[PDB]
Amino acid sequence: MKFAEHLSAHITPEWRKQYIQYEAFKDMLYSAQDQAPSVEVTDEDTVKRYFAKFEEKFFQTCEKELAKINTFYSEKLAEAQRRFATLQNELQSSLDAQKVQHRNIKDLKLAFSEFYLSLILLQNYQNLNFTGFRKILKKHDKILETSRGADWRVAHVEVAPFYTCKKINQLISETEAVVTNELEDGDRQKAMKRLRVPPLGAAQPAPAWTTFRVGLFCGIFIVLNITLVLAAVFKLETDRSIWPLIRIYRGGFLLIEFLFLLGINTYGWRQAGVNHVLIFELNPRSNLSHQHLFEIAGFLGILWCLSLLACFFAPISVIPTYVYPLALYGFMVFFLINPTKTFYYKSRFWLLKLLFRVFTAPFHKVGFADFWLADQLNSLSVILMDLEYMICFYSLELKWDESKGLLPNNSEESGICHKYTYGVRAIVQCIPAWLRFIQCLRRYRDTKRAFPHLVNAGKYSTTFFMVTFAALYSTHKERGHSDTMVFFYLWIVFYIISSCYTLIWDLKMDWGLFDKNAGENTFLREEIVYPQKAYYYCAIIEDVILRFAWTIQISITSTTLLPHSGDIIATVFAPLEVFRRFVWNFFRLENEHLNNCGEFRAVRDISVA
Numbered sequence: 001m002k003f004a005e006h007l008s009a010h011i012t013p014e015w016r017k018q019y020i021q022y023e024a025f026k027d028m029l030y031s032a033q034d035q036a037p038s039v040e041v042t043d044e045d046t047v048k049r050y051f052a053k054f055e056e057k058f059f060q061t062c063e064k065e066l067a068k069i070n071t072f073y074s075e076k077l078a079e080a081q082r083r084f085a086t087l088q089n090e091l092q093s094s095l096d097a098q099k100v101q102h103r104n105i106k107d108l109k110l111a112f113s114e115f116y117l118s119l120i121l122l123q124n125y126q127n128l129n130f131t132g133f134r135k136i137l138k139k140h141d142k143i144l145e146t147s148r149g150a151d152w153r154v155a156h157v158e159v160a161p162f163y164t165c166k167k168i169n170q171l172i173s174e175t176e177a178v179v180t181n182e183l184e185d186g187d188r189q190k191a192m193k194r195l196r197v198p199p200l201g202a203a204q205p206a207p208a209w210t211t212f213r214v215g216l217f218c219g220i221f222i223v224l225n226i227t228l229v230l231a232a233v234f235k236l237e238t239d240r241s242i243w244p245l246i247r248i249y250r251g252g253f254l255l256i257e258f259l260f261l262l263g264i265n266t267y268g269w270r271q272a273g274v275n276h277v278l279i280f281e282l283n284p285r286s287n288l289s290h291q292h293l294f295e296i297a298g299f300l301g302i303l304w305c306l307s308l309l310a311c312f313f314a315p316i317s318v319i320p321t322y323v324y325p326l327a328l329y330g331f332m333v334f335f336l337i338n339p340t341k342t343f344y345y346k347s348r349f350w351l352l353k354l355l356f357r358v359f360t361a362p363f364h365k366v367g368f369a370d371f372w373l374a375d376q377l378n379s380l381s382v383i384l385m386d387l388e389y390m391i392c393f394y395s396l397e398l399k400w401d402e403s404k405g406l407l408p409n410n411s412e413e414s415g416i417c418h419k420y421t422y423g424v425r426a427i428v429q430c431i432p433a434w435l436r437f438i439q440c441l442r443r444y445r446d447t448k449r450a451f452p453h454l455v456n457a458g459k460y461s462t463t464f465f466m467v468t469f470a471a472l473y474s475t476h477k478e479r480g481h482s483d484t485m486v487f488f489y490l491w492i493v494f495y496i497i498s499s500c501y502t503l504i505w506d507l508k509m510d511w512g513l514f515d516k517n518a519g520e521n522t523f524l525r526e527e528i529v530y531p532q533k534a535y536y537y538c539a540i541i542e543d544v545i546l547r548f549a550w551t552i553q554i555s556i557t558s559t560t561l562l563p564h565s566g567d568i569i570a571t572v573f574a575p576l577e578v579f580r581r582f583v584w585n586f587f588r589l590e591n592e593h594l595n596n597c598g599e600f601r602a603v604r605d606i607s608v609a
Contacts, residue, residue, distance in 0.1 A: 003135050009202045010128060012121055013273035014597050018072040019125075020065060020132035028058065029143050051144065058140065059152060062133075066160060069129050073162040076122050076600075083115055084171060090608055091182065104609065105183065109194065111606045112179050116195045117284055118603050119175065123168050133157050198285055202270050206291040214291055217298025224305035231312045240407035243567055244393060248325050248406075249308055251386030252332070254574055256301040258380060261582035263293035268586055272529045274593040280369050281604055288347055296344070300335075303328055311406060320403045325390065361438045365446055368592065374439055377432035378463075379581035382574045388428045392417030419478065426471035433460040433467075452509070459505055462498040469494055495550050503547045507540060511587035512594070527597075529590050539583050546580035549573050 007022050032054040037046055087108075094104055137149035137157075157163065180191040198204065236242065267290035269276045277284050307328035311321050336348055357364045358374045366374075377384075396417055398405045420426060437460040444453035473487035507513050513536065517526045524536050553569040 003132070007128060007132060010124070011201075012125065012602055013201075013275050013593070014600050014602050015072075015125065016273065016597075018068065018600075020069070020129050020136070022132050022136060025058075025061070025136045026139065028061070029140060032058075033143055055144075055146075055148065062136075062152070063156070066133075066156060070160055070162050073122070073126065073165070076118075076125075077165065077167060080115070080118055080122065080168075080171065083118070084175070087111060087115060088178070091178070094609075095182065107606065107608055109179075109183055111608055112175065112183070113194050114603045114606050116172070116175055117197055119168055119172050120197045121602050123172075126162055126168070130157070130163050196285075200284060204289070206289050210291045210295060214294045214298060217295060217302055221298055221301045221305060224302065224309065228305060228308055228312070231309065235312055239410055240404070241410065241412045242407065243564060244408070245308075245311060245406055246571065247567065248386065248390050248393070249304065249311075250571060250574065251383040251390075252300070252304040252307075252328065254380060254383055254386075254578055255332075256297050256304060257575055257578050258376070258581070259293055259297035259300065261578065262585075263290040263297060265582060265585045265589075266290045266293060268530070269589055272531070272590070274529060274589045275596075276589055278596060278601065278604060279589065279592050280372070281367060282350075284603075286346065288344075292344070292347075300332060303331060314403070320400075321406045322394070322398055322400075325406070326394070329387075329390070358435055358439075361435050362442045364442075366439050366442060371436075371439060372588075374432060374436045376581060376585075377435065379577050381429060381432055382570065382577075384428045384431060385425060388424065389417060392421070392424075420471050420475050423471055423475075426467050429467045430464055433463040436460050437464070456505065456509070459501050462494065462501050466491065466494045466498045492554075499548050499550070503544060506543050506547065506584060510584065510591065511539075512591040513540065513587075525591075525594070527594060529594065530586070536587075539587060542583060543580060546576055546583075549576060 004022055004026070007019070011019055037050060039047070091108055094108065133153065134157075137153045141147055141149040176188070176191065176195060179195060180186065180188045184191045266276065266288070268274075270289065276282070277287055307324040310324045314321055335343065336352065338345070338348065354369050354373055357366075358370045358377075361370075361374070364370070397408075397415055399408070437457055440453050440457040440460070444450060444457070447453065469487055469491040473484065473491050476484045476487055512525050514523060515525060518524055519526060521528055521533060521536075523540075524533065528536065530536070553566075553573060556565055556569055
């Protein structure tokens with residue numbers, strides 16, 4: 001494949017309908033060729049008229065395509081001219097006001113670098129549309145053994161006001177002159193370093209070293225997982241309680257799984273066309289492909305596996321076993337808050353600036369990155385409970401004056417910090433629900449709109465109530481007082497309500513499925529971005545199952561019996577919840593991008609002042 005894939009890869013995602021449609025032309029050509037009636041059986045007038053009809057139809061289709069291209073190009077050119085006019089007026093106003101100002105200059109820099117991107121994208125649009133006409137007309141010449149295609153090219157294509165309009169190059173030169181004289185006072189090197197746009201989209205291949213580091217961290221991870229399984233089967237002795245260990249190491253595994261599935265999500269968004277760079281407001285020139293997230297996940301998983309192995313084997317006799325989890329989590333934290341400029345600095349600091357804006361929610365106007373991150377925390381809720389458990393274990397239970405403190409004796413009676421001590425577990429549970437609830441309240445206050453925000457605030461109020469009733473029921477049963485089974489009934493009804501609330505919001509308002517304009521894609525949206533239709537139905541069924549995950553647990557719990565269970569339930573259902581979030585990310589991002597596809601948004605429209 002040479003140009004079909006080259007076109008589907010170098011195409012702007014939001015302008016997919018305004019392109020040349022190479023595939024339809026090719027399929028029309030091939031169908032017309034294969035349906036030649038007979039080379040010698042029927043009359044030559046028959047085949048001649050058949051080929052003439054095909055010629056007419058093909059050139060009418062090509063003419064309507066060219067008209068579409070011309071209209072879209074003139075539209076985008078007028079839009080860019082108006083944007084340049086308003087940007088220059090604002091720059092002149094600010095420069096005159098010169099005689100905080102740093103924020104002003106920095107947002108005019110950002111607005112100019114975003115206006116350059118639209119110009120470059122329009123230029124590439126022109127280029128690809130021209131060298132898709134030449135390719136398809138060359139194919140028509142070769143397939144029909146005629147030369148009318150090149151004549152049609154030189155007669156129609158190279159007169160059109162989309163290949164002869166040399167206005168974008170002048171606009172690019174003027175933008176560069178403006179940014180160099182005004183914003184940088186000379187120094188075109190620094191101006192162009194900000195304005196330049198690398199080959200972007202699905203067309204940029206990650207460097208070979210990043211792929212090799214992925215393949216290295218993944219092989220080590222596989223072998224270390226095999227070794228962990230073998231050592232757990234053959235080395236971990238009985239008479240000790242493994243539950244503290246895997247309860248501490250449960251959070252790290254969920255984080256590794258989340259980073260892996262986020263890498264897969266980024267790959268899916270990059271290939272399908274859903275551009276997360278515009279929705280997350282990332283830098284269109286510097287991003288993180290799936291390889292970077294795969295590498296981060298592999299490195300942190302290597303550290304996790306090494307810490308768990310050291311816990312099992314106890315390599316050095318002087319260091320007690322409880323130092324390895326502490327060291328692992330301290331390295332995970334020190335990796336994030338690394339003050340130097342190494343090891344994914346811009347990414348980690350963007351993530352930290354976002355985490356500061358989600359954990360102090362009602363004070364910042366929320367965008368997509370902080371709304372998206374606060375929804376991912378609902379799935380990574382066992383990580384917060386793992387941190388709480390680890391802190392309570394190291395502060396109240398871990399006997400420091402003994403080596404094998406991580407695995408105490410079998411005589412390990414209830415051992416507080418394992419349950420609802422005083423309600424702290426319920427609060428750590430409701431923390432991300434509280435974040436999203438107050439964020440939706442801030443959205444209602446800001447937009448004054450009510451439907452999408454006031455609803456979607458009860459979605460997390462139901463989690464509030466469900467966790468409250470869980471806490472009440474378990475703390476009543478642990479004290480064996482009266483009114484217990486009532487708080488089982490209320491737990492049941494509020495989990496029913498929570499799952500029904502989140503399920504209809506996952507499908508209808510988050511994913512956009514089940515709309516009246518479905519058309520041929522029954523039970524789906526109008527326009528589907530992901531290739532196969534089977535992905536959506538399987539996703540629907542999996543979200544139905546993984547949102548009602550408490551059915552299986554309350555069954556197993558009701559089966560009860562002696563084995564420790566609730567914890568086995570949580571350990572099996574936490575990666576299932578992270579996988580549910582991984583599935584939900586795809587279709588949330590797709591629904592978000594499909595709205596940017598209607599207004600043809602390729603840039604962020606950076607505000608000013």
